Symmetry: D2
Subunit: 115 residues, 4 copies
């Protein structure tokens, strides 16, 4: 898959499991429209979000429902969710891995782009 | 100052200067309405975005224009911007400091919440 | 393997490859002694550092030669290296993954402990 | 103040108070020699660790006792401490700010280097 998502819990030191993830693509009128979604596996990963044919150039937004994740663990969260917005470009073969590291009042997100 | 934003450059190890910042508040119709904007100073900090009187309860979005920052220095970043969304003042007024650490392909954001 | 290491470059957005990694164990006299070492693969990972029998409880230090990594890319680094010190405990099955995200003047390290 | 250390709590979103900090300088025999120590205040900052006159060239180690911090609040952390090692003043005197963001199983450290 050209687009992969991996979430980690910095508090417990483990993958963040069963975390809802929504992907959106920016439409011609600048509104966001559903593209893909799913929940992280037991490894904190979410694969098979899309395919090469479907994944065309453009601006994409990846939304991670961190709020629910924390509520579920009985921990008070600051953010409503963790957003990641980027432009997918066909500069040769490219796989996109959006890595997110979570804490109740802080999160880190990194993009690993490999060929 | 109830809402402050601080940005650092992780590559250079210095304050990220002139970083444009846009704040939005979710309207009673679920669309993002402009609330305030500014640019970081030489210390990488942005003060005076709003006031206690005007900073009411609500869901806020702090948009840091990271892309313009990196492009402004010959670098082609991954993210379009960094957006921090959170509910504020739902337990009474608080002072919020939104910190962001920037790298071309990665960013970190922390929120420091204290009382007045 | 009970101990794994993964390094990412936050500047280029890819795994940090061919990065030297040294593991040490704290001896009875508090000095650090060689335990294991290697260089990250093309995936930015370093496996097979040790085995269950060898990996006993105690205090371990994982040293990542980030300085060389940056020098090699013609980029000026701040830190001499990135250290990670922790206590390995036999609280039931445990695999240790030390994740490091690198930037010239900043680094993040997370420990993913799974069963 | 040529060397300052700031620590934040990523779980709570507040300054990490009373965090013990030990600084060492590599001696001409490759062993770590005590240079200075202190604890973070209520703002999570530690000032006055050393002076311009005493902070000479060298390889320094800043040891932040994260474990004691987390244990002091009923939490069993992963790391023993966070150690920041770096060469300082090799291009003339600079002001260094070592920042650290703490979580029970993870930490981030950034170095801000500026001129006087």
């Amino acid at each position: 898959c050209p687009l992969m998502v991996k979430v980690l819990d910095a508090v417990r030191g483990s993958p963040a499991i069963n975390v809802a993830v929504h992907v959106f693509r920016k439409a011609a009128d600048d509104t966001w429209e559903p593209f893909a979604s799913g929940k992280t596996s037991e490894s904190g990963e979410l694969h098979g979000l899309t395919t090469e044919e479907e994944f065309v150039e453009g601006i994409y937004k990846v939304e991670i429902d961190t709020k629910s994740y924390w509520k579920a663990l009985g921990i008070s969260p600051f953010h409503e969710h963790a957003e990641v917005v980027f432009t997918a470009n066909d500069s040769g073969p490219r796989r996109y891995t959006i890595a997110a590291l979570l804490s109740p009042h802080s999160y880190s997100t990194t993009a690993v782009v490999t060929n």
